[PDB]
Amino acid sequence: PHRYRPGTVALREIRRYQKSTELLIRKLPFQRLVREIAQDFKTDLRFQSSAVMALQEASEAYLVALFEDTNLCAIHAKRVTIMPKDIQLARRIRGER
Amino acid sequence: PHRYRPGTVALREIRRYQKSTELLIRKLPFQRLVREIAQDFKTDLRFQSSAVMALQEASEAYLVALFEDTNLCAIHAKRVTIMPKDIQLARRIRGER
Amino acid sequence: AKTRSSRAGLQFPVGRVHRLLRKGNYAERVGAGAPVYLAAVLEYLTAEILELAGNAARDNKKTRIIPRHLQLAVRNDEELNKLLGRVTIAQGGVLPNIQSVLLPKK
Amino acid sequence: AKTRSSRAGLQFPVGRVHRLLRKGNYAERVGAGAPVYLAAVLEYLTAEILELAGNAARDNKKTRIIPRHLQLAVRNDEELNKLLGRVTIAQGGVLPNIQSVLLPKK
Amino acid sequence: KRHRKVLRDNIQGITKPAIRRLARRGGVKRISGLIYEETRGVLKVFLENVIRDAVTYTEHAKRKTVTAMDVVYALKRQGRTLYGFGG
Amino acid sequence: VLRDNIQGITKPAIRRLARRGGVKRISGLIYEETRGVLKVFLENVIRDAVTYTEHAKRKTVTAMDVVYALKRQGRTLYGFGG
Amino acid sequence: KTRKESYAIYVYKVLKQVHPDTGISSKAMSIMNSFVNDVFERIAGEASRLAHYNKRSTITSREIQTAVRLLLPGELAKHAVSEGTKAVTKYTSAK
Amino acid sequence: KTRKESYAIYVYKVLKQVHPDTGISSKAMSIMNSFVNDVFERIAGEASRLAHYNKRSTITSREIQTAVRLLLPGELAKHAVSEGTKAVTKYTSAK
DNA sequence: ATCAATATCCACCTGCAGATACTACCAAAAGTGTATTTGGAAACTGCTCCATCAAAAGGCATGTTCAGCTGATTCAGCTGAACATGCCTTTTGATGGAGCAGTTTCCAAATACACTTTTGGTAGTATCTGCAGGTGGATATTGAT
DNA sequence: ATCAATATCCACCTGCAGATACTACCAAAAGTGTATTTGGAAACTGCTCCATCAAAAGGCATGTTCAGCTGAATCAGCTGAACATGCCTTTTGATGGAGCAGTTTCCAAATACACTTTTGGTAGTATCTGCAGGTGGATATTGAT
Ligand SMILES: [Mg+2]
Numbered sequence A, B: 001p002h003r004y005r006p007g008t009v010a011l012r013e014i015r016r017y018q019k020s021t022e023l024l025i026r027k028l029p030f031q032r033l034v035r036e037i038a039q040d041f042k043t044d045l046r047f048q049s050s051a052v053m054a055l056q057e058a059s060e061a062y063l064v065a066l067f068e069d070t071n072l073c074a075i076h077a078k079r080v081t082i083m084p085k086d087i088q089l090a091r092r093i094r095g096e097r
Numbered sequence C, D: 001a002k003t004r005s006s007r008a009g010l011q012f013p014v015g016r017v018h019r020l021l022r023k024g025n026y027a028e029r030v031g032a033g034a035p036v037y038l039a040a041v042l043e044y045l046t047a048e049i050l051e052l053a054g055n056a057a058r059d060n061k062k063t064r065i066i067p068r069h070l071q072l073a074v075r076n077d078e079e080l081n082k083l084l085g086r087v088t089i090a091q092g093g094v095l096p097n098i099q100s101v102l103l104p105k106k
Numbered sequence E: 001k002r003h004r005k006v007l008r009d010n011i012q013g014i015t016k017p018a019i020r021r022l023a024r025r026g027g028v029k030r031i032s033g034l035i036y037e038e039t040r041g042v043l044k045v046f047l048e049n050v051i052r053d054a055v056t057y058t059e060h061a062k063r064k065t066v067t068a069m070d071v072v073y074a075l076k077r078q079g080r081t082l083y084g085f086g087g
Numbered sequence F: 001v002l003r004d005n006i007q008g009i010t011k012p013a014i015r016r017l018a019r020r021g022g023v024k025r026i027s028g029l030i031y032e033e034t035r036g037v038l039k040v041f042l043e044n045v046i047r048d049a050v051t052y053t054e055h056a057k058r059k060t061v062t063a064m065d066v067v068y069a070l071k072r073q074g075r076t077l078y079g080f081g082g
Numbered sequence G, H: 001k002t003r004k005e006s007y008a009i010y011v012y013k014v015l016k017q018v019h020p021d022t023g024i025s026s027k028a029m030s031i032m033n034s035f036v037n038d039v040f041e042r043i044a045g046e047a048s049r050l051a052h053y054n055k056r057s058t059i060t061s062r063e064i065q066t067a068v069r070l071l072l073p074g075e076l077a078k079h080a081v082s083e084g085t086k087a088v089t090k091y092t093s094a095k
Numbered sequence I: 001a002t003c004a005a006t007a008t009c010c011a012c013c014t015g016c017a018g019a020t021a022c023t024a025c026c027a028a029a030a031g032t033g034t035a036t037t038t039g040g041a042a043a044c045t046g047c048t049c050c051a052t053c054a055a056a057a058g059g060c061a062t063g064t065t066c067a068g069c070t071g072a073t074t075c076a077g078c079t080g081a082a083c084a085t086g087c088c089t090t091t092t093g094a095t096g097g098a099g100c101a102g103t104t105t106c107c108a109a110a111t112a113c114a115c116t117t118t119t120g121g122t123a124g125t126a127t128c129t130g131c132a133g134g135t136g137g138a139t140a141t142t143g144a145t
Numbered sequence J: 001a002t003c004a005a006t007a008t009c010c011a012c013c014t015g016c017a018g019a020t021a022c023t024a025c026c027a028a029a030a031g032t033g034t035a036t037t038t039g040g041a042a043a044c045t046g047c048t049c050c051a052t053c054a055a056a057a058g059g060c061a062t063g064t065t066c067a068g069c070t071g072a073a074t075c076a077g078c079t080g081a082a083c084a085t086g087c088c089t090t091t092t093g094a095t096g097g098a099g100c101a102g103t104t105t106c107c108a109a110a111t112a113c114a115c116t117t118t119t120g121g122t123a124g125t126a127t128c129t130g131c132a133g134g135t136g137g138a139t140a141t142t143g144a145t
Helices: A008-019 A027-041 A049-076 A084-093 B008-019 B027-039 B049-076 B084-093 C004-008 C014-022 C034-059 C067-075 C078-083 D004-008 D014-023 D034-059 D067-076 D078-083 E016-025 E035-060 E068-077 F011-020 F030-055 F063-072 G008-018 G026-053 G061-071 G074-093 H008-018 H026-053 H061-071 H074-092
Strands: C087-089 D087-089 E081-083 F076-078
Touching (some): A008 E016, A027 E035, A049 A084, A049 B049, A049 B084, A049 D087, A049 E035, A049 E068, A049 E081, B008 F011, B027 F030, B049 B084, B049 F063, C004 G074, C014 C034, C014 G026, C034 C067, C034 C078, C034 G026, C067 G026, C078 G074, D004 D014, D004 D034, D034 D067, D034 H026, D067 H026, E068 E081, E068 G026, E081 H026, F011 F030, F030 F063, F030 H061, F063 F076, F063 H026, G008 G026, G026 G061, G061 G074
Parallel strands (some): D087 E081
16 A cells, blocks of 8 residues: 655646646547537637647647746745635736736 | 824825826936936937826836735735735736746 | 718718828728728717716816826726726826725724 | 849848738838848847757757747747747747745755 | 537536646646636636637638638737747 | 935835825835836836837937837827827 | 827817817827827727738728727627718718 | 748758758747748838838838837847848848 | 814815917818729639548546645734924926927939749659657655654 | 655667658749839928026935734644546547639729819917815814723
């Protein structure tokens, strides 16, 4: 019977995902989500597959950067755990509200 | 023998200054600071009167707003006292750092 | 002779707008209604703001609109505020606003 | 029988750059030195980025520059990072960077 | 075409683990359980904004297909310029 | 009484700004931080305005020089022309 | 000496429809002028881009409309669009 | 089979100049292509505005020069400006 | 609670800075009639690539367990708010002169047009190679003790 | 420290994806050359409006005092990390047509050019007034007790 202490695998993952560049959201789910949202704006739409890929690359790059800012917001609050209040503070200061 | 509690005049000035629109930096010191700074870019410069004015309106708008975000950052860390780190966090998240 | 604005029912200079579009290197060519449409949009947006800025004058017991009234109009409307979200109105001040945790205790 | 690129000592295509300035409607007229000066700036910047990207390729024991290497080049250089501070390089990832307090012990 | 599958709740394909990976790339060590719904919301807003603009370009062109270029131009308007897909 | 011009941006003026921004209590170290910040702001904008001046072959920075600099730095200002 | 143009009078004409008993400061009018010039540039600019993306030599009302949709928030867009389509209708019919 | 142009061959020439044994992947080239188009558009735009601001109808190497100093940061600007000056001088003297 | 120090409120008055009004004016747009150039919807059809179906690769959902993080509590001490005014810097206003802006000139450079050549793209069919993803095998990191 | 479970790092290999290659070809380029148009530098100059400075205004640098804020120390409760376990969903590779995108004809529309009409900016002189800034006295707020 064996265990890592909480945070050890977490740092392992940070090192891993910061070293690579693969998209981290599964392709098909993300695709459906695109098509759903688009459909609500306009029916009988198609998408070049590179269009979806462009959205995915932009979406993940956006979210990854948001989590750095969020993570800096928790750390400012003497925490190491990101919470919704941190995301919100990030987005207010960013001018997303 | 009568004294105001710490933070009572602070509130009073917030209401006062939020209500008005005068510039809050004295014109002359600002004028010199502008010229000083412009001297490193080109010597023997003159400034329209409206040019210096435009620079002041912009800087104060900027600084006022940066204090709003800064103050939000202090409040996030469960404080009421703005510190350089709060100004730093706000500038980092705004993407000025 | 009769102005293109009056034809289009507008107080805003369709002609000037047309010209300003040509000498703006926006495109080789410029259709006949583009300046009409553009000019209406500008009139419209101007009115909306004057409507609200006038309303602000009224509140503060004034009849002459000043920058403070444009600022209060713009930042108290969610949509105008978004459109002017990276714009500074000279001499506008800010909205009265104090974070609740900074209020004294009851 | 000589191109303007070779006249200016440039690999980048001056004629092409002249052509793209005209059809982009930046101004009525386009001077003769403009596509020359611009084509050179373009060449200067792309050389700077390939130099640094090539190094990142070599630091990873690779021979083919891929987008990760472009991202490493840009983001590790203060000035390129600022010039491209509102741009996203598909397939570039991020820089390794863990904040201190997150590391183990004291 | 005959019939056309109904799309709903797809926001939930953005799974807890996929969101944790993005956090990780972003250097996050510890994640409150409320982060996942909040992140889904924020993602939904981001996509609505970019797709609206992208689809507007599609329609202005009189097409039924959203191109990579529609998305690239939408991304540029919104200050999130993307290299790697044609612009 | 020899003194740098940055210091003419005084404690009470910096306090007034804060106040307009809703700030109640202020760390002493803020005054130097705020001057640093203001200096960088002006550098970036003035640099660009002056560059407009040099381009127009002038020796006077116009308000339009400034307004144009502010626009490209994403700080569009209304009321000084343009 | 050189004539310095402005949207000021057109702004002032519209003030009076909207608020016939209300006036406006010098500084306030200058801001309204910036405003019109700014929105002008923003819309034209987007419109130019649209034409170029679509290999077209012309900026018609369709480009101005799409531009407005892209630039304006929700309700402002919608009312702006209807005011724009309106003025073009009226203009065509009028001889 | 419409001809789609890019800066790929030039990017490659310049690549061989600086890292003679290094290749570039097509995705990496795609981004290099985007980067050139992007900087072109941004310099050309500043130049456009600059001309207008100064009531000029012509974009010369002088307009491009200013656009470079406005757009690029310190050192990149210094050096870009060398290489563009150098190329224009050498262009003028080469006929 | 009361009591008093001081801030805040409202009304009314008043001089003038800054607004609206005005006519000449003239000059420069904007609009009106005639001849010219050009763009882009419609009609048509090749053919890319998007939507939509079945089989194989591995990540997701869920429950359990307890490490250690968060947020409450308390509390000492440090640090920023409040305070009085003579003192020194900024503001207000008075006056030469730098330079910006208005105007006219004329030519170097740009636009236009018409063969003439070069080249950058693709397409067809071939030919080469960097490295991703598999293996096994030697060394680092981590956590219990 | 010692032991060991597990992750991480090499190195070496091998199929094949995707990259470099090449030969045919060509349409759209870029180049060359000669004709005609003009933008903007250049040069004189008139008049703002900008720097400078004396006198008049008034905001701020000063140090003392202590309220109350920030941050360290401590601790319980419980959230979120790790991991084992059962399998659903995505991924990967191979077959039908909606719609994009490329050609061409043709008129509805925008450009051009020159003309004739008016509008909108300025200046001139004067014409007008909303309200900032000051008064007085009634009432609210804050803080001491
Ligand atoms: Mg739906």
